[PDB]
């Protein structure tokens, strides 16, 4: 038998680890030399849809071509490759990707009701087939640098620099910068609430240099997490707009359970059967890392290659249309299999420390119209340089609320 107890208030503790990413994975001016064939084909696809009355690298097209499927005639539904001459958008018509495999002898569609989503998903798949062929230490160089992003930083009263952030390549968002990770330095504590004693940032989005067909949303991604824990920012993260001062008040809501003799959770990675592919980051155990390692294991066994959005064990290769032609078919098969998702859930233990950095988020315009000129003129000098604009700059404060913890804990009777 276990008895629960509850504690609430303010306590001095390590300030959360904050990870900053840009909403675009790459700098278009630095990666357009790889994507030019795909961009020319994407604009030809858009012209075929939008302006049909008006050569291309069809080796890209034949990987997963988009098809119109027209069912306006129940006795003769007809499927047509995109390549008056109008494509159908009536109530009986849908748009799909033809995912073919085994020398194309047997294959299936992935279906969309709308062209905007069909084109988004098609381009993401094709761009992934291109990025998976670039070595990661070169792929890092055509993403956003800490020099460009972190215009100013100040923690409490201590000045700060982009060299205070640990850098990782999170393949869906490119380079990400982690403040106060507590990995190779001692983590910073704080002992007072309010913005005056918190993290103060000014960030440059570089919005005009986005990849046009990937970066549909503009802002930074943010995530608060424990020291020495991996930032799964595609699940947990929030956005922040440019042109505003965003203020985030943090409260650490924690729930601590008893271990194996009382519940099936774990305090370590031990006696979990899944091989942890995030181990090379030296991070602490997490159910999220276990689930993704389980998926990447199934991927490496069924497709014979690993997917680009996940880490990779030492002997394997990422999936390419050049090396592994069937990869898109088998990857969609795995990605959509709910039985596979439940298998990983049934295989990974969850950790006994559940913790949530609860946030109250508020916003206002920044700079004011009166204090605009001199702030942008001075911000232009904060780098070795001018290429700056209001639509690019975020002002961001992160701080502890008056009560900064709520802990619920189990104890043995």
């Amino acid at each position: 038998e276990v008895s629960v107890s509850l504690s609430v208030g303010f306590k001095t503790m390590d300030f959360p680890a904050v990870t900053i990413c840009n909403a675009s994975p790459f700098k278009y001016s630095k990666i357009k030399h790889l994507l030019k064939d795909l961009d020319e084909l994407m604009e030809a696809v858009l012209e075929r849809i939008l302006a049909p009355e008006l050569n291309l690298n069809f080796s890209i097209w034949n990987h997963t071509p988009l098809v119109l499927i027209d069912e306006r005639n129940p006795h003769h539904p007809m499927v047509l490759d995109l390549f008056s001459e109008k494509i159908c958008n009536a109530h009986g018509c849908k748009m799909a990707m033809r995912l073919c495999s085994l020398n194309r002898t047997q294959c299936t569609f992935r279906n969309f009701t709308s062209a905007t989503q069909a084109l988004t998903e098609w381009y993401i798949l094709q761009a992934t087939n291109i990025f998976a062929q670039v070595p990661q230490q070169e792929l890092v160089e055509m993403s956003y640098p800490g020099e460009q992003m972190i215009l100013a930083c100040l923690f409490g009263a201590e000045p700060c620099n982009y060299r205070n952030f640990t850098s990782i390549f999170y393949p869906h968002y490119g380079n990400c910068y982690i403040f106060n990770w507590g990995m190779t330095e001692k983590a910073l504590p704080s002992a007072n609430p309010g913005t005056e004693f918190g993290l103060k940032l000014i960030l440059d989005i570089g919005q005009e240099d986005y990849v046009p067909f990937l970066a549909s949303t503009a802002g930074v991604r943010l995530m608060l997490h424990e020291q020495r824990s991996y930032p799964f920012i595609r699940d947990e993260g929030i956005y922040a707009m440019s042109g505003t001062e965003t203020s985030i008040g943090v409260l650490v809501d924690k729930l601590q359970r008893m271990g194996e003799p009382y519940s099936p959770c774990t305090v370590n990675g031990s006696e979990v059967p899944v091989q942890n592919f995030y181990s090379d980051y030296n991070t602490t155990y997490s159910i999220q890392a276990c689930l993704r390692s389980c998926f990447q294991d199934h991927m490496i066994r069924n497709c014979n290659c690993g997917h680009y959005l996940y880490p990779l064990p030492r002997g394997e290769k990422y999936c390419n249309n050049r090396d592994f032609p069937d990869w898109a078919h088998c990857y969609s098969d795995l990605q959509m299999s709910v039985a596979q998702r439940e298998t990983c859930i049934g295989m990974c233990k969850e950790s006994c420390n559940d913790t949530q950095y609860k946030m109250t988020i508020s916003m206002a315009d920044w700079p004011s119209e009166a204090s605009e000129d001199w702030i942008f003129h001075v911000l232009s000098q904060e780098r070795d340089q001018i290429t700056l604009s209001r639509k690019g700059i975020v002002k961001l404060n992160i701080y502890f609320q008056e009560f900064n913890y709520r802990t619920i804990e189990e104890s043995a009777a």
Binding site: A23, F213, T217, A218, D235, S242, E342, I345
Partner: protein, 381 residues
């Protein structure tokens, strides 16, 4: 005495029902034939009071201070409202007359005048697979017109989330036709959304989070439950089965449903008619100036009594013992980005079948941040 305990689970998780509304209830050019006289009178008032170029209850001026008064029949008394700003004068007077016009129009016609699901929804996408206007249920609300509910329809199994995060939740793009807004009723441009149980009434007029256009709104959420004990341990009910009040919302019991049902019933007692803002109770009529010419003052007195707890509703209705909540984390970003406007807006208007303005659109993401379901349980010792 009792023992509290906490059970946390990680497993595939049912998705809530999501009711989405436009802030504006009807496409104005469609209702303008009903509201033509009221628009004429309102623009005459603006031209008379403020020089703007542009019948039982007139608009008045006082020693400018602008207002109106709501009067009783069987005595000389009236409740007089005087506003220090013309915005409140005009908006509140217009809404009085608007609600007394719309209360007389039949529901069959109001449902046809408001938005269709194919108009409100440009795209929908759930669990990585396509979704369509046919996946939403109609919910007609008297102050927001046709609202539409995701993941709540008859004899279909509830949709469940087996993967957390933004990519596998509900993603929907909304068309918010702001050139067809009503000039005097609706002064805010966007949409509203409620997250609720499938058997729970959304009350989208009260507690809905608001969606801004030219923006992507990212509603990440966690699930938490609480289970109290009823009597002897607490004066609380698991169901509506042992409270004197009749429920009129055709939805599972909760304290606000009980309090509003009690008040709507007290109105059918005292004023002889039902308030149009709320569902119609059995065998009653909505209030309007021609059949119930003095209901304004009756409602004023009755609600003043309610706030002073003289009607008993607050002591008769009880808290519900089982409680489920989604703790939302709303956050916003600009959408489309200035580089993606070049192709997103053309393809979005092709998906409708003029070019869309960036401010006519809003993108909404609703997702479980993680599959962790917390619960707090109370049990006898």
């Amino acid at each position: 005495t009792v023992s509290v305990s906490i059970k946390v689970h990680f497993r595939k998780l049912d998705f809530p029902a999501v009711t989405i509304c436009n802030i504006n209830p009807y496409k104005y050019s469609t209702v303008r034939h009903l509201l033509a006289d009221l628009e004429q009178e309102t623009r005459e008032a603006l031209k008379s009071l403020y020089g703007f170029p542009e019948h039982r209850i007139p608009l008045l001026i006082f020693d400018q201070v602008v207002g109106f008064q709501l009067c009783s029949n069987d005595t000389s008394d009236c409740a007089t409202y005087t506003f220090s700003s013309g915005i409140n004068a005009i908006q509140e007077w217009y809404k009085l007359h608007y609600m007394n016009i719309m209360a007389q129009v039949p529901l069959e016609k109001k449902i046809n005048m408001s938005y269709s699901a194919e108009e409100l929804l440009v795209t929908c996408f759930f669990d990585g697979v396509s979704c369509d206007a046919r996946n939403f249920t109609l919910f007609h609300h008297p102050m927001h017109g046709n609202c539409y509910t995701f993941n709540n329809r008859e004899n279909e199994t509830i949709l469940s989330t087996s993967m957390g995060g933004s990519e596998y939740g509900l993603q929907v793009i909304l068309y918010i036709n702001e050139e067809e807004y009503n000039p005097f009723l609706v002064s805010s441009t966007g949409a509203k959304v409620i997250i609720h149980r499938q058997d729970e009434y959304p009350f989208v007029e009260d507690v809905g989070t608001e969606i801004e256009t030219a923006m992507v709104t990212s509603i990440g959420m966690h699930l938490t439950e609480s289970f109290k004990l009823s009597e002897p341990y607490s004066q609380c009910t698991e169901d509506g089965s042992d409270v004197p009040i009749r429920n009129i919302y055709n939805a599972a019991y909760s304290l606000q449903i009980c309090l509003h049902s009690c008040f709507q019933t007290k109105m059918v007692e005292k004023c002889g008619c039902a308030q149009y803002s709320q569902p119609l109770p059995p065998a009653a009529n909505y209030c309007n100036y021609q059949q119930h010419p003095n209901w304004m003052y009756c409602y004023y007195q009755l609600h003043r009594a309610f706030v002073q707890e003289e009607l008993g509703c607050q002591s008769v209705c009880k808290e519900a013992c089982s409680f489920k909540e989604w703790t939302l984390t709303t956050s916003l970003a600009q959408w489309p980005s200035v580089v993606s406007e070049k192709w997103l807006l053309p393809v979005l208007t092709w998906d409708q079948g003029k070019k869309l303005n960036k401010t006519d659109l809003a993108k909404l993401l609703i997702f479980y941040k993680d599959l962790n379901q917390r619960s707090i349980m109370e049990s006898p010792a």
